[model samples]
Target: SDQNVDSRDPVQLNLLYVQARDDILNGSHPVSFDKACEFAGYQCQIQFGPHNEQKHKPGFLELKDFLPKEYIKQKGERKIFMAHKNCGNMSEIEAKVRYVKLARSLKTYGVSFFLVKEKMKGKNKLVPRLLGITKECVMRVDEKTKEVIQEWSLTNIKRWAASPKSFTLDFGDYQDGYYSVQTTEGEQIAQLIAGYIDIIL
Candidate 1:
């Protein structure tokens, strides 16, 4: 073996921290409502500091920032405040560590999702699809069901390239063949793959 990367650098850890939080924030990952509340609570502690009984009112800070849109719609403001209060003495560092750990337990911890238009191998039309990328794989997700329809593991990715308007993957096989995604976020997606893949190796 050439070398080993048994630990993450601080910068890599920081990237993981933000991406995991975004997964919860966007309501993409399947976290239970109660668990989501707990995540929000810890996130609040991390951002706004330890909750003060008098200073932290129901409307003091925006819950939307700490929660997914659907969660905000389902639960009232005071309920979230209760969740925030439950995080009694979690300090900033502890909250951050806890938040990232909690998020990592979910199945899609490291996957970052992007909505893009995809053209079938032989079809001329492009359809809206959700593309997910992680250190290990790329996934095509069902929009309505949130299920992964297809996945290409990093080992199977023969080559990948991104342009101003799209990202393409060549699998070099008969079954998976070629895949292409059209999106303005192409550069970001490519960079994420490169960065994540680099850290793992």
Candidate 2:
């Protein structure tokens, strides 16, 4: 029933952005960007960002400027999909097209689209890190049939966390094998992704 609502209604945008910004800034509520947008009347279409350590690299905020207004204008009354963060593995042109197709289908219901860039926690290794919506990865489905089309892996964690530790592990050989270390890497990535999304829309 909610999908029946018009996605182009500016009122929906206002509410979505307001709530999203509040959640991000306060840090009190923890909702996936996709879920937040969905509840606020937006179609969750996220993209990944680069995992490198470049300050000026293209991020969600930067996409607002990087994407040409003319392209967005062509969408007519539909709310355009902006990459809220740098696309990790989803940066490939083919992968983006799939997401675009998904967004287009949800436009009729007044649902919008957004993507966040994947941030790299450590240097090298290219591990599966957490994302703004770490629990759910991207899923492509047929517009009419509702059948799954494809899925893509974005963030890297283990490899991303691999770095030269200034200090050595005194635990020695016992530390070998699978060891889980709690780090803020996931939360940090989510915060930045959500923050940028809030800033842009």
Candidate 3:
């Protein structure tokens, strides 16, 4: 195939990337790694994604590097990032690491973190929260912020035990919790974990 690509077009490249993503998502078999590289026309590579990445808390290491901007924009990537997180695909430790990484990355982008929560206290009206970063980085946002950690489908695919001051990703026996985002991106995190299945956010 001689090919008929512009080779210097972001629109073209992004379109290719989208098609690639759609194919990848729907389990459509089409290209090889090298073919993906050719179609994408960059170092273009797919990352740790098989679908519903927001279903459970798993696969962070493989899903780390954000695709080069040439493939798609941050918005599209966010959709990918929130695609799904299957809780059964990996280990608890693996899931937590991904959560921390996602939280850090979202914070860096100044994007809102979403989380869904449940509290049966007083009138017992548990609500969701959409938090960003504190004035000094994850100083842990607010009240619902804490609840955000104890959920899933809000993000990742698993549940983050609940550690407001989690600074490390070492999980030989890591059993605690992570940080905020809430119903904003938060619900969109542990989901009131409600988990990532698609509603709005």
Candidate 4:
């Protein structure tokens, strides 16, 4: 009577475990490994830890080694990070990890991080707090030893209570609401994000 059978003609069994840790610095939610697995179809459990409980929390981090200085000069002081859905049905955890790595890389170039929460007209809006960070807060590790060289907290920085400016643009004669731009004031947000990562990697 079980229709959820695998190719072997037996019901498949799966287990998952998740852990949550506070991102006090950025004011973002802690990473949840179990939730990542569950999104891909697996029965799972979750756990939580204090800020100092573990050596490393569930979240991921990467450093940017080759950000262009020209980009920083062109984009100026304002920046926005886009977390778009990619193919392969990647879970949010995967996306966040990718973002963390890319963002960390940008840190070397003196670019700050901001959280953007978009919502459809009739959908719910879940925006994470955008806390500021000082130059002292960003961290980097040794390439050979793979050890942390710095530790910084973003909490003390200023918070932008209101959403940043955004816009939607339509080509000469297009009428569909397909092409739009939010926070597009003298800055190319998408280009900055793409350039931050190593495309070949």
Best by TM-score: 1
**What is the overall TM-score of model 4 with all chains considered together?**
0.20
Which ranges of candidate 2 are over 4 A from the true structure?
1-9, 17-128, 131-201
Please list the residue runs of candidate 1 whose C-alpha ends up more than 4 Å from where it truly belongs after superposition. Answer: 1-35, 44-61, 68-97, 110-113, 119-130, 141-149, 174-177, 187-201
* Winner on lDDT (1 vs 3): 1
Candidate 2, residue 110: lDDT: 27
Q: Give per-residue CA lDDT, model 4, range 40-109, as digits (tens).
A: 1211011111112133222211211111221222221111111111213443343334343433343222
TM-score (C-alpha) between model 1 and the true structure: 0.52
Number of the top candidate by lDDT?
A: 1
10 residues in a row with least lDDT, candidate 1: 1-10
lDDT of 1 by residue, 21-131 (tens): 887888667455677778877777877887888987766767678777766766645666677787788666666777898888765555678889977768889887878
Whole-model Cα lDDT per candidate? 0.75, 0.31, 0.32, 0.27
Worst 10 residues of 3 by lDDT: 36-45
TM-score preference between candidates 3 and 4, better one: 4
TM-score of each: 0.52, 0.19, 0.19, 0.20
